Write a protein that binds this ligand. Structure first.
Ligand SMILES: OC[C@H]1O[C@H](O[C@@H]2[C@H](O)[C@@H](OC[C@H]3O[C@@H](O)[C@@H](O)[C@@H](O)[C@@H]3O)O[C@H](CO[C@H]3O[C@H](CO)[C@@H](O)[C@H](O)[C@@H]3O[C@H]3O[C@H](CO)[C@@H](O)[C@H](O)[C@@H]3O)[C@H]2O)[C@@H](O)[C@@H](O)[C@@H]1O
Ligand SMILES: [Ca+2]
Ligand SMILES: [Ca+2]
Ligand SMILES: [Mn+2]
Ligand SMILES: [Mn+2]
Lengths: 240, 240
């Protein structure tokens, strides 16, 4: 289909169109990407991702069209620790994507250690909300919590300072305009605090024509819950 | 998802989200539900169907919600003969639905011979565009071409006389309003010739909460091409 759209105002336990990977699972009308104990408390060493089952037609070679898409979502992070890790990410990847071996912790369940920073060995675009930046383990991160745009590498092509607020929902709008090739990210807290970051990227030289969209999260030695509360997505092919 | 929407202005050959069953296949940016020979002509004894891969949440018991949906599509029938058979149908059925044994010809690939008229044995709602009605084989049909609403039986609960026009596209709009429970069908040829048939049906009593939507067509001894040219669909769960 040239256009596809779907919305999850909440996440009831009875799902049919979501592909669960790793420890991801639904609890209390929300997606808990990372594992939690019986008390609903976050645990270490966990990775989880979800993907919408239907494939998205991102671009079409034969007709010179590229999709205009928008992803609006809401999530909250919670941890009794002062340094909850590692973060959650909205990503776009080939349809057959699976959790890479050893992609836990700072790799956010998106990259394999061996090629995490090799832009030539990956095919993924992701917007990360990264809360762990210890300069000794996450050597690629700026020294502070941040929102980053990742293009085939865990080392963001760009970041902006971000404030982690325990138990508060962050509303995010990610959009791509094929005309300007601008990928824009706008995130806000309920008090109006706003964050914005934009990047120009030709998705055609990074991803195949058909892809799957979803979320990924992980916790290494430090942990926190990564709760996806809502998500709506829309995509339509346009001439360029 | 509470809401799902997709649109196929045309049908390029590289499909990812369509389930092809029987003889259905893509040709010339359109879906040929029934088999055709090399030079593109219709052949006898052929059944074919397609379903969108993502499951549609038709109703949710926990919230007492039912989806309002709208399916828009156009198709054309072509046949060297003037007695083209057997027809095309838009249908909604459980997710695991498959072509029943011996459902060719007048059964349109939707019902099994032994239970075609047993309502309590089927789970399907379909809008049929029936062009063959010989009373010896299709004993359940009115004596003329027609559009019918089928609820668990090949014997339509409601029909309207219809005119088959070889090689001309029929634009169809099917809508279900959960508030009134009316399933409305509006079909028109480009010259404005309009056909309307409606029926009140409580979908919760006929189909499971999650379903799949698609098209089915077949030809027995008599034949014609069943070309699905475009298809748009949208459903949203609502409180009544
Ligand atoms: O150095 C100060 C920082 O300490 C804390 O962070 C540590 C640190 O960055 C580094 O320390 C390595 C070792 O240090 C020793 O002193 C002991 O503390 C050892 O236990 C410790 O292993 O790395 C630590 C481990 O990093 C993992 O966890 C982080 C946070 O979740 C991830 O971002 C990393 O990617 C990494 O995860 C990987 O390894 C895990 C197993 O070790 C595995 O489970 C994952 O799947 C993944 O492969 C780190 O905790 C902390 O207090 C900082 O705030 C402080 O600045
Ligand atoms: Ca990090
Ligand atoms: Ca018939
Ligand atoms: Mn980062
Ligand atoms: Mn009939």
């Amino acid at each position: 289909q040239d256009s596809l759209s779907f919305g999850f105002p909440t996440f009831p336990s009875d799902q049919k169109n979501l592909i669960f990977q790793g420890d991801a699972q639904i609890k209390n009308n929300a997606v808990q990407l990372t594992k939690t104990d019986s008390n609903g408390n976050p645990v270490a060493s966990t990775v989880g991702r979800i993907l919408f089952s239907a494939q998205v037609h991102l671009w079409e070679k034969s007709s010179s069209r590229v999709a205009n898409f928008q992803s609006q979502f809401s999530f909250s992070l919670k941890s009794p620790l002062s340094n909850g890790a590692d973060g959650i990410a909205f990503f776009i990847a080939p349809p057959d994507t699976t959790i890479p071996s050893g992609s836990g912790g700072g790799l956010l369940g998106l990259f394999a250690p061996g090629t995490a920073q090799n832009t030539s060995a990956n095919q993924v675009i992701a917007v990360e909300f990264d809360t762990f930046y210890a300069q000794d383990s996450n050597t690629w991160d700026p020294n502070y919590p941040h929102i980053g745009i990742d293009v085939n590498s865990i080392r963001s092509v760009k970041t902006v300072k971000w404030d982690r607020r325990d138990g508060q929902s962050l509303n995010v709008l990610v959009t791509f305009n094929p005309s300007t090739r601008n990928l824009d990210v706008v995130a806000t807290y309920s008090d109006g605090t706003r964050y914005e970051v934009s990047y120009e990227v030709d998705v055609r030289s990074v991803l195949p024509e058909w892809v799957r969209v979803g979320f990924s999260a992980a916790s290494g030695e430090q942990y926190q819950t990564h709760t996806l509360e809502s998500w709506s997505f829309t995509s339509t092919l346009l001439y360029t």
